[PDB]
Amino acid sequence: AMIVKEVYETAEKIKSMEIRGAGRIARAAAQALMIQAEKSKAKEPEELWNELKVASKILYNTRPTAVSLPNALRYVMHRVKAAYLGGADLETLRFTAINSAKEFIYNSEKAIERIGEIGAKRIEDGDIIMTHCHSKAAISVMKKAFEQGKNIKVIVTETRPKWQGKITAKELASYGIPVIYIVDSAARHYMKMTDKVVMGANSITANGAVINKIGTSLIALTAKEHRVWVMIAAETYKFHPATMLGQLVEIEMRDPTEVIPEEELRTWPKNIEVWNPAFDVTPPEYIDVIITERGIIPPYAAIDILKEEFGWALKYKEPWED
Amino acid sequence: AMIVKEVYETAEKIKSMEIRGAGRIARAAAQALMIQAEKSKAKEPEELWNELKVASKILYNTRPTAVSLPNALRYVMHRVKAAYLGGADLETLRFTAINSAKEFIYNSEKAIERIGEIGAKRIEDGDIIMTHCHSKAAISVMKKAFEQGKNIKVIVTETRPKWQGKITAKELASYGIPVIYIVDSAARHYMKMTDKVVMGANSITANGAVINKIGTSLIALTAKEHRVWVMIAAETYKFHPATMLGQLVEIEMRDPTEVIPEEELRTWPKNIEVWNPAFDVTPPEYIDVIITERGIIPPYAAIDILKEEFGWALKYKEPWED
Amino acid sequence: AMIVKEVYETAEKIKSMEIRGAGRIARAAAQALMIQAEKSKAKEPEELWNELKVASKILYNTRPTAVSLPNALRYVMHRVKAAYLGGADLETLRFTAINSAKEFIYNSEKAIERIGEIGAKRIEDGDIIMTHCHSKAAISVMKKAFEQGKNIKVIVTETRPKWQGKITAKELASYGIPVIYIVDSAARHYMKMTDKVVMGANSITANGAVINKIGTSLIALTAKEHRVWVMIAAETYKFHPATMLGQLVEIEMRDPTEVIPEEELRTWPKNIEVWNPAFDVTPPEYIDVIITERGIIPPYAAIDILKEEFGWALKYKEPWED
Amino acid sequence: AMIVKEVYETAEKIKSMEIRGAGRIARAAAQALMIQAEKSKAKEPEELWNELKVASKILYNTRPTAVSLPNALRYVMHRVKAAYLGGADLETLRFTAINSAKEFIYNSEKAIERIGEIGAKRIEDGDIIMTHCHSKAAISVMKKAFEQGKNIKVIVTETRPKWQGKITAKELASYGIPVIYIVDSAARHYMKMTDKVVMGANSITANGAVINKIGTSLIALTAKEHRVWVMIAAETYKFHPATMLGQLVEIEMRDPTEVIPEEELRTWPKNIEVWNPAFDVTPPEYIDVIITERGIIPPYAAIDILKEEFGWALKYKEPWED
Amino acid sequence: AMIVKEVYETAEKIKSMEIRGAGRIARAAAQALMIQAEKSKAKEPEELWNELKVASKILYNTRPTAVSLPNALRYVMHRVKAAYLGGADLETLRFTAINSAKEFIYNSEKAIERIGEIGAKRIEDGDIIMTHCHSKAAISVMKKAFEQGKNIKVIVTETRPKWQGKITAKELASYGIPVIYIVDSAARHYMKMTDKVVMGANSITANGAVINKIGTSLIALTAKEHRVWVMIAAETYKFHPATMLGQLVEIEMRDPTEVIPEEELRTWPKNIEVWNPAFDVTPPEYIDVIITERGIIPPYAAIDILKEEFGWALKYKEPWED
Amino acid sequence: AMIVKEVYETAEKIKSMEIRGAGRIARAAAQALMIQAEKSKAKEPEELWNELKVASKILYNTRPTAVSLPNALRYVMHRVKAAYLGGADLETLRFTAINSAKEFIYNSEKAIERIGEIGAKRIEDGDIIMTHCHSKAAISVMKKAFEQGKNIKVIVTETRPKWQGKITAKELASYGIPVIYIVDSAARHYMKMTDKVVMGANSITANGAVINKIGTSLIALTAKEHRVWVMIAAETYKFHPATMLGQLVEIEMRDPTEVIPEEELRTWPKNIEVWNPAFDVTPPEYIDVIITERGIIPPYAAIDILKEEFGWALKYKEPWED
Ligand SMILES: O=P(O)(O)OC[C@H]1O[C@H](OP(=O)(O)O)[C@H](O)[C@@H]1O
Ligand SMILES: O=P(O)(O)OC[C@H]1O[C@H](OP(=O)(O)O)[C@H](O)[C@@H]1O
Ligand SMILES: O=P(O)(O)OC[C@H]1O[C@H](OP(=O)(O)O)[C@H](O)[C@@H]1O
Ligand SMILES: O=P(O)(O)OC[C@H]1O[C@H](OP(=O)(O)O)[C@H](O)[C@@H]1O
Ligand SMILES: O=P(O)(O)OC[C@H]1O[C@H](OP(=O)(O)O)[C@H](O)[C@@H]1O
Ligand SMILES: O=P(O)(O)OC[C@H]1O[C@H](OP(=O)(O)O)[C@H](O)[C@@H]1O
Ligand SMILES: [Cl-]
Ligand SMILES: [Cl-]
Ligand SMILES: [Cl-]
Ligand SMILES: [Cl-]
Ligand SMILES: [Cl-]
Ligand SMILES: [Cl-]
Ligand SMILES: [K+]
Ligand SMILES: [K+]
C-alpha cells in the first residue's frame, strides 16, 4: 500500500509527543487520513480503501490510552467504509475521506469553544482554580471566564515527568491570567485556598471514570476531601465506547528516560526500575461534573453520551479492519 | 564574639541544603557548637558563654521548620547555661558544651538505629513499601527489614523539587534492596500494590500532626483511602515543644529557582509566581503509628512525648537568649 | 404597558413572601398571566402580546432562586408566543394564554398529589420522619402515608428566620399527625431516632444538586452521616434547564430584618452585618432519591428529567424576550 | 381451574429452595406456565386463559424478593393476555404461552452467557476475586475469565445459613479454578488481598440499590473501604419495575430452623428469637458497576434500564389479574 | 438548715439562666458558698459543715449538664471536708470555705485569660472564624488574636432558642472586631469561607467528647467535612470525672416556652410537642484540639486531664454527701 | 523435668478450645502453674524453678493470639523468678508460685466484675445491643445493665465457625435477657435498629487496635458507618506489651475441619483450600471506648495502660526463659 510520508510523520510525532493533547492528536490523525486521500495515486476505489485502512492502522498504533484518536479514525472510516461498500467510485470515496476528516476537525474546534462557554459560566469572579497538565479543553474554560471579566487566578501544577504545566503556565499568562506555579506534591497543601479544579480527559469510561494525565486522581481525591468542585472539560469524542462492553482502558507506560535522562539513568544499578505511567484513573465519586459540548453532566451520565452516540458501532468490527 | 569559621560554614551549608535531612542538620548544629567550644580562645566563662549564645543564634536562624535543630541547640545549651549560672569556670563550661554536644550526636545515632529495629518488626516478608523524600529514620526501618531476610521492594517517589528521591533510590539499591522509582504524581496509581508506607518527619506537633517534605500529606491521604498503613519514623527530638502552648509551625518557603532554573525563570512572564513550600502538614487521622526510639505510639500520643521530655522548658526563655 | 393591578399585587406578594413555597408562587404567576389576559383591553394581538411579555418580566423579577416560577411563565409564554408568531388573532391569543395558565395550574396540583402517592410508599409504619421548612410536596407524602394508616410522627424543624416550621407543625397536626417541634440546631441530636428525611426543593440542577430552604444541606449531611434516607419531593418544574449549559443558580439574599427586627437592629453597631441567605445547596451525594410526579429517581437522573422535558428550549431566547 | 401437577411441584420446589437462584427460579416459573399450556385440556380460549392466570398466581406467591420471578411471569402473560384480548382462538393462545415461555428461557440463558463475556473483560490475569452465595451470573464471569487463560483464584464465602457457598466452591473447582473457602466473617480480613468482588442480584431498584443474599451489603461495604471494585452481574430481568413508583422490596424472612436445626431449637429458651432474613440491601454508593447482558452501567443507570424496558407496563394491572 | 438568701437567689438565677455560661455559673456557685460561710451564724464547726453541705446540694440541683458547677463545689468542699474531719474549729472551717472559694474564682479568671493567649496563637491574620453560642473561653481567644493586630472577622451563629449569639455579636463588636451574624441553619453555606471554628464547652468526657450548646455538633460535623479546624476552648474544670467510670452526661431539657412563647404555645394543639435540648454531643473525631489553661491537646488526651487532676476523688463520695 | 498431668491436660484443652475465652485460658494457665507448684516433688528450689519454666513453656505454646495467656504466665513467673534469684528456699519459692497464681485468678475475677459495673452505666433503658462471639467481659456488662432494671435486648451473632454465639444466646437468655439471634452476614442489615455494640478482646495493641474473634472488624466497620457506639470490654491483661516495640500479633489459623467437617472435607477436590483465621484486627478508628477495670479510655490510650503497667518488663527476657 502506497502510504504518504505525512501519515508516517504524523504517527512518529504522536508517538514522540511532539504532537500531544488528546484532542490535538485526534485532529492530527483525521488530517493524516485527509492528506493520504488527497495525495493518493490510487486508480481504483479498492486501492484507495486499502491505503486508508493501512494508514488508519498505522495511526491507531501510536498511543493507546486516549480514545479521541480511534474515535477520529472511526468518524472518517465508518463514512469511508459505508461509501466504498455502497459502490462509490474513486473520486466519491476520495471526497468522502477528505470531507469526513474536515468535519471531524471542524467539530473538534467548535466543541472546545463551546466547552469554554458552558464551563465559564461555572467560574465566578475571584475564583482560584487549580488545573493539571495542559488541556486545551480546560484552558478554553479559564480563558473564557477571564474574557468575561472574572478576575481569576490559576494554580498550575508542573506535571512531571514531561512538564506540560510549563506550557499551561505560559499560555494562561499570555492571555493575562495570573498563575501560581507549584510542584505536583503541593496540590493538597494549596487545596484549602482553591475554589475549583478544572482538568481535562484522555478517555471517559462507561461507569463515569476519567483517565487523564498521571496525578489527576490525586488532585481529584484531595479536592473531594476539601469540598472543592472537580470539573472535567471533555469533548464527546473523549468518551470510550468499548468500555460499554467491559473493555479496560490500557494505561500507556512511556520510556523511563522521560523521568531520569539517559546519561544519568545509565549510571544507575540494575536493581532500580523506573516506572512511568502517563495516566491514571479518577473514579466518578471524585468528579462533580463533566463539561461536554452538549452540556454539563454528572459523570454517571457518561453511559448516556456513549449510548446515544457510539453504542451503534459496537456490533460491527473496526471500520478499518480487513 | 569571636565565632569560628566552622559555625559560619555549617550555617551556610544548612541554608543551602548541602547538609539536609532533619536529624542530620540537628547533629551538624550540635557539632558546630562543639567546635566553637573546642577552639574558643575565651579566658573567662562569661566570654565563652557569650560565644556559644551567638553561635546558637546563628545556627537557629538557618531553616525554621525542622524543630530537630533548635532541640539540638537546646540540649547543649540548657546544660551549658545551667553550668554557667551555677558558676562553672572556663574549662568546666567548655567541657560541658563539648560533652553535651557529643551526647546529642551519639543519642541521635542510637535513636535512628533503634527506630530501625522497632519499625522493621512491622515490615513483613513480601512487603512493598512506599516512601517519600530521603529520611534516614525511614531508611533505617527498611534497611533493617531487608537485613532480617524479608524480601521487600521499595517504591521511591522522586520528591520534587530537590529530587531527594534519587538519593533514596541509590542508597536503598546499594544495600541490595529492589527499588521502583516513580514520580510523585504516580503515588495513588501505585497505592493498590503498596503494603506499607514509611516516611520521616521534620516536626511533630502536640495534636499529633506531622510536618514533613512537601507531598507527604498527599501520600498519607491516599494511603488512608486505600487502607495502607502509614508509619512515620521519627526521633523524639522531632517533636515540637512550642506547639504545646499554641505555636504554629512555620512552613519554609524556598527559592523559586529550585523549581524552575534561573536561566528559564527569567524568561517567564511577570504574572506567573512560583511557590515552593518545602513541607506540608499531615493530620494525625492519616497516620497509623509514629515509631520513636522509645516505641510505637499512636499519633495522638505526641502530646505525651512532649509532656514527659520537653514541657518543663516552656516556663523559661530559650537557653541562648539575653 | 397596560398591566392589570393583579399582576402588580401578585408580584408584591411573591416578593414579600405573603405568597411563598416554590409550587405556589409558580401557580400564582400563571394565575397572574391568566388574569392579564382575561382583563386586557387590547384590540390587536400585538398589544396583548406586549402586555404578556411585560407582565411576565415583572413576575420573573420578584424572587430568583426558585426555577418553578420561570418554568411556569415559560409554560404559558412558549405557547402564547407560538400562537402569536403563527398569526393568531386576538381571541385566539387571549385564550391560549388563559388556557395554558389553567393547564400549568391543574398539572401542578395533580403532580403534588401524585408525589404524595409515590412517596408514601417509601414511608413505613412506625416511621419517624424529619422535615424542614414547609413544602407542599413533602407534606403530600407525609399526609398520604398517614391516610394509609401508617403511624408516623414528624419532627418539624423551626426553620429560621421566617419560621416556616410553624406552618408545617400546625398543618400536619391538623391532619391528626403527631408532631415534634425542634430548633434547627437540634437536627443532629435527633437524627439517631429519625428513620426518614423528607424535604422539598426550589430548584434542582443538572448534576443532581438541590437548592432548598437555608439549612436543608446540614440536615441532609447529618442524615447521610447516620445512614438516614434523604428524600426530596419535587415536581418536574423544579428542575432547572439553564444549569444544563453551566448556569449557576442565584441564592436569594433577603432583608436582614427578617433575622433581627428593625426596632432591635437599628440599635446595633455598624460593625455587625447580618447575612440572610434564603437557600443553600445540597450536593447529590447526600440525596438518596427525588420523588417526582413521574417516579423515583436517583439525584443523578436529574439531567434526564431536564433533557427529556426542557432541553429543546435552550436553543431559543426566553419566550417573553423581544 | 385444572392446574397440572408440574405447576404445583415447581411452586413447592421454589418455596423449599430445592430450585433456587434468582435466574433459575424465573426460568422454572416460565417452564411451569409452558407445561400448563402444553397439557391443558381446555377447549375454549377463556378456559386456558383462566388456567394460566391461576397458575401465574400460584407461581408468584412462592418467594417475594427476587423480581426475576414476576418478570418471567409478566414476559409470558403480557403476550398471552394481548393475544386473548385480541381474540385468539385456543391453539393460538396456547402456542403464544408456550412460545413466549421458550423465549424467556432462551433469552435468560443467552443473557447469562453474555454477562460472562462482558464481565470477564474486567477481570485481569493474577486476579483474586471474592464472591458471595451462588450466582450463575457471577460464575459466568469468573468461568469465562478462567477460560480466557487468566490465572485467577476465587475466594468463596460460605454464605450462611443455607451454605450456598459450598455449591459455588465445588462448581468453580470442577472448572479447574483455584478456590479459597472462608466463613462470611472473614471477608474483611481477606479484602486486602482481594482485587475484585463479583456478586449477583435478586432485585435491583430504581435508585440503583442491589438486593442480594444476606451479607452482600457487608462485603460491598468493606470492598469500598478497601477500594476493591464491586461488580454485580445481573440480567435486565433482575431490575424491579415497581420501585419506579415508590414500592419497597419485601425482604424474605425464612424459617428459623434454617439457622438452628429444629432438634436444637426446640430445646432453647423461649426469650431467644431467631431472625433469618434471606437478603439485604446494598446501596449504590458501594457498587462500581452492574454488568447486564446489554453492557456495563453505573448503578444509577438502573432507572434507565427500567424506563426503557418496563416503565410502559406500570399504567396497567398485572397481566394475571381479574 | 440556716441557708442565707444569697445561696437561694444564686440557685434561682442559675436555674432561670439569668446567670449562664459554664465558667460563670461555676464561679457563682463558689461565690454562693463563700457568702454562706461569711454570713453563717453557726457556733460549732458541725453547724457550718451542715450548712455548706446543704448549700452545695441546693447549688448542684440547679442545672445538670455543665460539670463546671459540681467541679467548683468539689474544689471548695473537698477542702472544707478535710479541714472539718481533721478537727478544725469554727473560724478555721469558715475561712477554709471562704478561701477555697476565692481560689477557684481567681483560678477560673486566670485559666480563661491563659486559654485566650494559647488559642490566639492558632489564629492567623485574615482569619474568618466561626463560633457558636456565647463562650467566654472562645471569646478570650478571639479577643486576644484581635489585640495582637490580626485582622479577623467572626461569624456568629444566632444560637436558638435563647439567642446567645446576640450577646456574642454585641460583645465582639464592642472590642472592635467585625462580626457577621447568621442563623444557625446557615453554618454549612458559610463553612467554605471559614478558616477556623472556635467554640466552648460545658462538659468534656473521658473519651474526648464535647458537650456544648445545642447545635455545636452540626457545626463541628460540617467543619470536619470542609477540613476547617475545630478548636474547643475549655478550662480543666470542664472535664467530667464521673465519665471515667462510665457515667453518661445528662442533657438538660428546658422549658418549651423558650422555643415558642407561652402566649403562642397555649393556642397550639395537644398533638404538637416542643422538645428543647440545651446541649448536644460532639464526638472527638470532629474536634482537632482542646485549648485548656495547660495547653493544646488532642480530644483523646481528655482522659489524661482527668486522670492527672480528678481521678483520685472517684474513690470517695461527693464531699457534700453525708 | 517432672511436669504434672494437669499442666499437660490444661494445655491440651486450651489447644482444643475445650477451655476458651481469653480471660478464662489465662486463669487456667495460672491454675496449671499453681498445681505444678503444689504437687511438685522438687527437693531443691532450682529443680522447682526448672519445672515451672518448662510448664510455663508448655502453656505458652498452646494458642498464640490472646496475650492474656502470656500475661498470666508472666504475672506468676516474674514473681517466681525474682524469688528464686533472691535466694528463696524451696518452700518460699513454692508459695510464691501458688500465691501469685491465686492473685492473678482473683484479680481476673474482680476485673471482669468491675468492667461490668463501669460498662453498665453506658447502657440505657431500651437499648438494643449487638455482640459477637462469647466474651465474659462483654457479658458482664449486659448482665449488670439488666440487673440495674434497664430493659435491654441483645442481638447475638452466631459466630462461625465454632458457633460461640450459641453459648452467648443461651447464657444471656438464662439471665432473663431477651435475645435476637442472627447469622454473622446479617450484622449490617440489623445495625440500623442497634443502639450499641459491646464486644470483647483477645489482644489490644499499642496503637489502639483490637484483635478479637473473626468478624469483629466487620461489625465495628458497619457500626461506625451507622454511628453506633462500639465498646470493647477488656481487662488490662488483654493489652499487648510486645507491640510497644513493634511486634506484630500472630493471627491463629485453626484446623479447616472446624469450617467443613472431616467427612465432607475429605470428599472435596484438592484445588479448594479452606482458610480459618480465628481472629481479625479492628483499627482504633472503629472503636469508641475500651472499658477496662480501671475505667473508660479512648482506644488511643492503650499505650498508657501499657506504659504504666507493662513497659518495665520489656528490657528483660521472658521470665520463663533459661
Ligand atoms: O484534549 P485536551 O483537552 O487538550 O487534553 C486532554 C488530556 O490529554 C493530555 O494527554 P497527553 O499530554 O497527550 O499525554 C493530558 O492528559 C490532557 O489533560
Ligand atoms: O531526619 P531524617 O529522617 O533523615 O529526615 C526527616 C525529614 O527531613 C527532610 O527534610 P529536608 O530534606 O531537610 O528539607 C525530609 O522531609 C525528611 O523526611
Ligand atoms: O413547592 P413546595 O414543595 O411547597 O416548597 C418548596 C420549597 O419552597 C420554599 O421556599 P420559600 O419559602 O418560598 O422560600 C421552601 O424552600 C420549600 O422547601
Ligand atoms: O440468578 P443468579 O445469578 O444465579 O443468582 C442471583 C441471586 O439469587 C440467589 O438467591 P437465593 O439463593 O435464591 O435466595 C442469591 O442471592 C444470588 O446472588
Ligand atoms: O464557660 P463558657 O466558655 O463561658 O461557656 C461554655 C458554654 O456554656 C454555655 O452554656 P449555657 O448558656 O450556660 O447553657 C454555652 O454552651 C457555652 O459554650
Ligand atoms: O475474655 P473474654 O471476655 O471472655 O473473651 C474475649 C475473647 O476471647 C475469645 O476467643 P476464643 O473463643 O478463645 O478464641 C473471643 O474472641 C472473645 O471475644
Ligand atoms: Cl478502565
Ligand atoms: Cl502547625
Ligand atoms: Cl448552582
Ligand atoms: Cl427497597
Ligand atoms: Cl455522654
Ligand atoms: Cl498487629
Ligand atoms: K494496597
Ligand atoms: K485489595
Numbering used by the authors:
A (entry chain B), B (entry chain A), C (entry chain C), D (entry chain A), E (entry chain C), F (entry chain B): 3 to 324
Paper excerpt:
In summary, our study demonstrates that PH0208 protein would function as a purine nucleotide dependent R15Pi enzyme and not as a homologue of the regulatory subunit of eIF2B. AMP acts as an activator of R15Pi and in its absence the enzymatic activity has been found to decline dramatically.
The other catalytic residue, Asp204, reported to be vital for ligand binding in R15Pi enzyme was mutated to asparagine. However, quite surprisingly, a clear electron density of the substrate was still observed at the active site pocket of the PH0208-D204N mutant protein. Interestingly, the PH0208-D204N mutant held the substrate at the active site pocket indicating that the residue aspartate alone is not responsible for ligand binding and there might be other criteria that govern the binding of the ligand. The mutants formed strong interactions with RuBP with Kd values of 7.5 and 7.2 μM, respectively, which corresponds to the binding affinity of the substrate.
